[PDB]
Amino acid sequence: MDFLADLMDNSELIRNVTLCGHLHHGKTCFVDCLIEQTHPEIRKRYDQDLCYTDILFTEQERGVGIKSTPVTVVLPDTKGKSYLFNIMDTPGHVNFSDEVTAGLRISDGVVLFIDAAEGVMLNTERLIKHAVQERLAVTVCINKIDRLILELKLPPTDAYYKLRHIVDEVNGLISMYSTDENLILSPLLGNVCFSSSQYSICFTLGSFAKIYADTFGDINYQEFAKRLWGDIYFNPKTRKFTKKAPTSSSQRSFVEFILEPLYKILAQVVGDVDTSLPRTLDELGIHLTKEELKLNIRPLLRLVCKKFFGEFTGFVDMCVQHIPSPKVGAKPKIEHTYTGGVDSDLGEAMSDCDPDGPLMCHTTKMYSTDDGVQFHAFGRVLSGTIHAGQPVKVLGENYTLEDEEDSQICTVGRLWISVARYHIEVNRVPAGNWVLIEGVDQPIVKTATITEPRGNEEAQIFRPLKFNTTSVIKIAVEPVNPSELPKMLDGLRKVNKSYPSLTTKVEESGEHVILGTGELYLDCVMHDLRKMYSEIDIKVADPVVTFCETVVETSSLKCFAETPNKKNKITMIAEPLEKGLAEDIENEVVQITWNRKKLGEFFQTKYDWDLLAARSIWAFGPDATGPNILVDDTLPSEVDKALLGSVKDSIVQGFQWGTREGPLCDELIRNVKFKILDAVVAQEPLHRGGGQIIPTARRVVYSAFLMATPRLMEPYYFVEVQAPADCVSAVYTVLARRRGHVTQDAPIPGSPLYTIKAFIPAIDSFGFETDLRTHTQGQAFSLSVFHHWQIVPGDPLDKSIVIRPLEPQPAPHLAREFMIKTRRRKGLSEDVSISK
Amino acid sequence: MWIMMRREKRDRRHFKRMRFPPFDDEEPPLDYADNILDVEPLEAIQLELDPEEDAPVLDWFYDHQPLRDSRKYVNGSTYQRWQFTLPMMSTLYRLANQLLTDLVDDNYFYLFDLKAFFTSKALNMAIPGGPKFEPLVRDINLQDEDWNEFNDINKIIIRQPIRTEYKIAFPYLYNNLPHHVHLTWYHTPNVVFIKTEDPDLPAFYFDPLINPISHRHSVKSQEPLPDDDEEFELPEFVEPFLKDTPLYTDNTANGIALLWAPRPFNLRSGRTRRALDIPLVKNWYREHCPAGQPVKVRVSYQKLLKYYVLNALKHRPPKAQKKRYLFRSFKATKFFQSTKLDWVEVGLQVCRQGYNMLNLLIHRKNLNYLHLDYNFNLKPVKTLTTKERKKSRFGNAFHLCREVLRLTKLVVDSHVQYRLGNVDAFQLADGLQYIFAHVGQLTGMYRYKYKLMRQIRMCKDLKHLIYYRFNTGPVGKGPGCGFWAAGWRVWLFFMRGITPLLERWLGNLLARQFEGQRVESHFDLELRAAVMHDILDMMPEGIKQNKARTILQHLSEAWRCWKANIPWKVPG
Amino acid sequence: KDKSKELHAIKERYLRKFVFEWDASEDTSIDYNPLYKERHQVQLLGRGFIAGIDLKQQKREQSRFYGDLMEKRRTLEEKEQEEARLRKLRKKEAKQRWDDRHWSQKKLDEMTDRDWRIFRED
RNA sequence: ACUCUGGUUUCUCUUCAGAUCGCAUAAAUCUUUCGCCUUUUACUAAAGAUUUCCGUGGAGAGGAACAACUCUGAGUCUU
């Protein structure tokens, strides 16, 4: 037990991994198998999956993992070397992408999981991109190999064909996301593992070569581990592996020396269990008693495969030599994560992960207790050492060097490293490891840079947790009895803490609004809000979708705005951006930190913008990645550049906030270009203050937007469904009912299931996940995630459109129906006026 | 039995439903010694088994207790914890394909799980295929929630209506006040299983139901690979682990297809269940819906599911006991003996015993104007004068006992008709199903305990379920169904329910000694009695005890004075 | 008529006698929309059939979609055994169709004791 | 490949029962809430709390049958 702490002290025998993968792909069962390997007293039930890491009750009843769970375990390697493994088995549901990112910032390794009978799915398509964008080594473990044999009953050659088709599709798809050309995955190289979690089967080519070497002996398992995967074969007469076929009915090496023995052993334990089973266990050295042979087929298969393969050494040596150690992976993690990068003193102090250096651990999760009162933070100690009772300094997400007010000095109460259900109390946690810090819940929402007090003077914070999806769905929350409203404020704060992309908000009409990704996500968060944190009654409005406001054409007149003093006068024009330019802003392709020359060349080549304005672009919409843009287009002779540069900041401040709110209603402004045609600034810095410019800035922005023909943009969810070919029409009929349209219907190779990829309006996608399965009697299944935004049909600003109370309106009325009710939901005026 | 009873209903153009009662009246049940013992029984309903396939079960399939003697398969005569080989189990599974839906996963039960039904009950909402329930809490005022600024219509966008199944799938998002609600989203990865149909085929075959992989080599996506005779050599000893053993045996396809069999047929071994506790058509009304069936069987499906969900919800763990068996104490007693006997003899014996009991109960007060016939019908020997009519009346318990005796007498007489060659085995089964599906019509027991209507309706619902599944294709409509075990068990659960009630009422009735607006009467008399008891108790035992009425009058006067709000102060 | 029914449902949401036969008012399968009025019956890969219903009745009643899919994918080299097994089935249940025959076209010599009882019962 | 190893079945008695005792499912009583409401006996149909009933698992004890054919782990596991 103390060897756990001894290995904990070292920083090179430690791996930080995430077993990220699609929904229901065996990740939780894989961790359960690892636990069953380590802990002997923990034995899985004969039929019910134990689901060890599924510790909260809601995922124990719904059957889907919801929140990532830390697992700290010592795993022997193929050669028997112990390694300390930090496992963050992220939930697989695409609506739960919050926890994938939350566990991916604090990990250096990505262990993908792909169902052998399902192939690459929607989820994985985004996790490979995300992990590459976060600069982690990516490794694939095709799980549920049993499906190719006990369910599909494929010939072993076709099983290998399926395996290579799903292996190279990962390589082919990842080549778009990965700039480097060292990221080619192949089991012969050691990137790819093969496993069946239910039957505990797990191997890399090296491990299986180790089994053969163990049996026959005098075998070098490395050379034989190579020359297994591929189109090469084996010659029984010359005992050499050849590219060409040694016989007419030849067979690939992998199939011949790995897949075929698996087929035979599991067929012997599911067929002729009574006649030819002892014969095939004598030939394999697996000795069993009478009472362990009287079990059912599934437990017998799991036991026999545990005896044959043994411990999960294949996963261990797959992980060890193909993901960097924290001492090695710290440099890319820091240069992508720390705001100042490696260049700063603290940045250079991170490249080596010194256990005695400065402590600026990073926490990215909130694992509540069983009473829900206090929140135990979870984070990685990127460097330094932490102790129980140590007086520590917790930073925030708005904390900077200039803004020293966003921090708190706290006392680390206790420290313990956690493995799912049970936690191990430790007085000291060294660098490069994980920990649940206690007593730091008060000054944190979501991420935090918990660092030393009065010891890290110039230390900055870590970058905000950037996600892959966007919080789209929006639900109103109120107490049943307003006499217990404060009881619900703290519950909303708690759920905001325990959900990385949850966005609580109070609006002008005294409305509490919760933002989420999908139906199941909001179901889980409100179940937590009701039965866990607030233990009161809560009324919910039916889900509504956040909208966006855009333009399609230039304004008829150059509408302007002046300060109340009638001295400053700013004239601006709102026009749409080039198709695809908005995406090239949100993807961090271009930034405001760029120098002028690079952005000028970018807009001169890719978007053919004139250099007279390409070097006169101030801001990029709201926040930093906002899709809108502010453009300076005043001729220098009429607007003094020296005089302009004073309000150059305030105009942006009134613009970065001007586009955030939106004149039509309190919704984001997207895909709009603002050209300034005239500036009349006060010649003295006295009357041109921010309190006068900023209202004028927002007013001129709103006036230009309104005078330009405005439109609403609704977010479309990208829905994939997997159904047998008899139910493809049953998906077309459902998707046609909700204004959707199908993009592709591709059968999955090596499986009768299909994959129908379509788009569906988010406001029109409520219940579709149930409207499909019930219509197809549960055979079909859908997953949804936000893809893009589209102009809502119709003109949002027509007064001839009448909104009936309780029946859907046609497409042309939608743009009018959506905002007005939204306006009514916002508490604003019924219509829009040019004064706004 | 299901696969053949559908054939004789298709073979016999007309069918003769056995008479009911199958026996005449005023005639005692036939003696077992003279008639039943000698007559050779007719052939029973049995399927000829194909020795080419059904051989593993050919030797013993239609025995009384199959494999009772075989120590290899069963533990012994206690007949528990059977062990069955895979060929045996596969043969049984193939033979039971008519009573087994071919569902591999449970994704077909998306919103027809019992957890979803618990949710629907706790929400006072009904799945279209699901049952209706009374509200858990009336909350009529909570139903009449006022038009607030929260639930205001003009603030709500309606695109697609929030259907009940939406509020059931996500009972914490689409609705309010979700008390005693359960969750289920068990979208198990839909198992992609393709059961073989070819008797001759490789077990691991690439059947066309699988979309081809379509392997390609267009782009030179090469990987580290060796050349011929490149720094490697294999030992002569080393080989693939299993070379001698074939890739697939004959029992491989059956074994793999046995993985995804229903619950009973995925066990290599397991404990033994009773004949009562095996619901054969349980997985029939649990199905999603009947495919375009009339209303009188759709409502039957909802009414079966309603009772199923009610039993599932109201289930409680059994209470810890001390295991006092009843017949074992009888065997201990000197008054009883054990003997192997034919069942029909036992029925003819018990009918006479119950008839004698009821005649004794009738002639308990020596009233000769009530007579019980041999069909358990209580009739007057002469037109009843009103005094004698009222003088000879029995409570609901006696009538219930008489009617259940009539039911068992009907069953026994039907079996006797079978043994006497009066009816066929098919006729016997159809008659038994009619008895167990029309107990109300044949016996007026519901007039003596109203709750029986449930069972009555239950059985009728079961009929509808089996019939619509029985009268399918070329079978047609007629009295040719003998699948009685579906409704036969229900009256046995009714029997275990009513056994102690009758065993207590008869005990009270048939014994040497017979035994047979209350809160305002509670605290007046008891309190005053306690006060007087204490006062007289501590009052000295002399002649002064003549003053008890004085104390009672003082108590009454004080109570009156408090009631009259008048000062009460006795000086002495 | 679906539109009026669904709008009406929206308005609904947001605003002694020993009888044995049940009532038709307890029926719940009534639906105002097609996607639940007419649910896509599970073809179950065509090789799986509902328990109670007869097998070949389902086979001929089946949508045949997987039948034509197999006709498309199956190659000639592995159609011979399909045709052979199909014809062998047709022959072996033709055995039952002819050997087990109604007495209306069974002669006296063909007619057996079971068929004799069938005729006498008729 | 040497050893000691050593029964399962069956019928009872006595307790403990966590667990789907039971991959099944009845009845009664009581307290609330409805429905009916004309009084008991039947009910109504949900809730809660009880009890009996048909069964069950485990442990132990006592007999009987295969009690003596075996058999299992242990071992130094002896060319």
Ligand SMILES: O=P(O)(O)O[C@H]1[C@@H](OP(=O)(O)O)[C@@H](OP(=O)(O)O)[C@@H](OP(=O)(O)O)[C@@H](OP(=O)(O)O)[C@H]1OP(=O)(O)O
């Ligand atoms: O009169 P219907 O409602 O159309 O149904 C009848 C009725 O049975 P149910 O009324 O109970 O459904 C018949 O006689 P009873 O049952 O009323 O005495 C008989 O049913 P039995 O076979 O049980 O006598 C018959 O069935 P079949 O056509 O199979 O003879 C059929 O019932 P189904 O409508 O369920 O077929």
